[PDB]
Amino acid sequence: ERTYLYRGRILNLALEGRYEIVEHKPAVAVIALREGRMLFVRQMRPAVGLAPLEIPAGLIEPGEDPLEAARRELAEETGLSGDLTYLFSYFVSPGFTDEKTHVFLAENLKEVEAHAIEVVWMRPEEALERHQRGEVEFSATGLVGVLYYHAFLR
Amino acid sequence: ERTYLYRGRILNLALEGRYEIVEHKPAVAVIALREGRMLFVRQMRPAVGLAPLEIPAGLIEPGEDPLEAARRELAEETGLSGDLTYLFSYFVSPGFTDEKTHVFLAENLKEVEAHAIEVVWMRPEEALERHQRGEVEFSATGLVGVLYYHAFLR
Ligand SMILES: [Mn+2]
Ligand SMILES: [Mn+2]
Ligand SMILES: [Mn+2]
Numbered sequence: 001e002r003t004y005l006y007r008g009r010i011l012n013l014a015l016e017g018r019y020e021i022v023e024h025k026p027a028v029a030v031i032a033l034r035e036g037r038m039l040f041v042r043q044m045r046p047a048v049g050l051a052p053l054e055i056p057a058g059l060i061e062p063g064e065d066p067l068e069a070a071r072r073e074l075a076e077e078t079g080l081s082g083d084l085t086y087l088f089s090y091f092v093s094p095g096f097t098d099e100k101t102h103v104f105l106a107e108n109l110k111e112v113e114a115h116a117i118e119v120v121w122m123r124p125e126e127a128l129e130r131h132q133r134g135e136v137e138f139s140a141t142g143l144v145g146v147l148y149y150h151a152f153l154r
Numbered sequence: 155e156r157t158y159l160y161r162g163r164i165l166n167l168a169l170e171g172r173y174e175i176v177e178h179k180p181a182v183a184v185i186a187l188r189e190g191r192m193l194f195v196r197q198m199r200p201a202v203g204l205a206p207l208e209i210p211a212g213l214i215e216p217g218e219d220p221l222e223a224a225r226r227e228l229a230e231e232t233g234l235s236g237d238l239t240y241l242f243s244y245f246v247s248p249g250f251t252d253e254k255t256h257v258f259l260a261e262n263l264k265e266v267e268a269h270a271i272e273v274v275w276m277r278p279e280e281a282l283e284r285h286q287r288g289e290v291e292f293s294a295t296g297l298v299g300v301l302y303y304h305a306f307l308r
């Protein structure tokens with residue numbers, strides 16, 4: 001049984017026996033390549049005090065399925081639309097939270113909207129080199145995008 | 155400024171203005187291949203109500219650096235030691251937590267200890283196929299291991 005210590009905006013904190021559990025909405029993330037550049041985004045993230053390299057991502061809102069949320073986040077964060085294909089999912093940190101991320105590939109991108117979030121097109125090889133030299137941090141979604149590219153999109 | 159709602163065992167919950175922040179110790183994860191099998195582990199994870207496929211992982215304890223924690227988790231979870239090389243790091247979910255994971259490669263594994271955590275040696279190709287067919291869930295660390303193998307270890 002779970003007893004709730006805090007019910008919030010994008011998380012709840014519960015105790016389940018000895019375990020501390022953070023309930024969190026599920027998320028999506030979108031991997032997109034164009035002319036050998038991957039579509040990264042950066043934003044200040046107060047939890048870490050910096051702007052890591054991420055890919056377009058966000059929470060699934062009421063009424064949405066993961067594909068629909070992926071389309072929405074791509075449009076809202078970058079002004080693009082594409083043909084989306086589901087790839088895989090992962091639990092971000094299942095030792096304490098239930099957040100699950102659904103990852104999609106986007107192809108054939110088109111600008112639909114001419115408009116906080118910085119769009120950072122960057123070759124994945126360069127993102128990995130900058131990270132190895134200490135110049136940028138990754139989110140899980142950014143690292144998954146870079147590794148997926150190296151594994152399957154070259 | 156952060157105001158603390160909960161100070162716990164492996165997390166704290168804070169508010170920073172409008173933001174809900176979970177402070178969490180940093181973690182390590184170890185990618186290891188032997189005879190084409192990757193070293194996965196599974197354990198019941200009460201936060202998600204299931205046992206995802208992970209790689210050996212754990213929290214960095216007081217006094218340890220990431221390499222030392224990686225050695226310890228490999229030994230404690232699987233009874234092995236190896237030659238460790240640092241690969242990269244990632245923030246698990248920087249929209250709400252500061253947990254950072256440091257990922258290592260282990261080579262030349264040796265059993266040092268004959269002894270909750272299930273050791274699951276499995277070809278990464280098969281782990282990915284089982285996940286695509288809905289048979290297993292991944293943690294971020296398990297998915298990172300599979301993608302890193304496909305990118306760089308074949
Ligand atoms: Mn976002
Ligand atoms: Mn912008
Ligand atoms: Mn562990």
Ligand SMILES: [Mn+2]
Pocket residue numbers: 270271272273
């Ligand atoms: Mn065991």
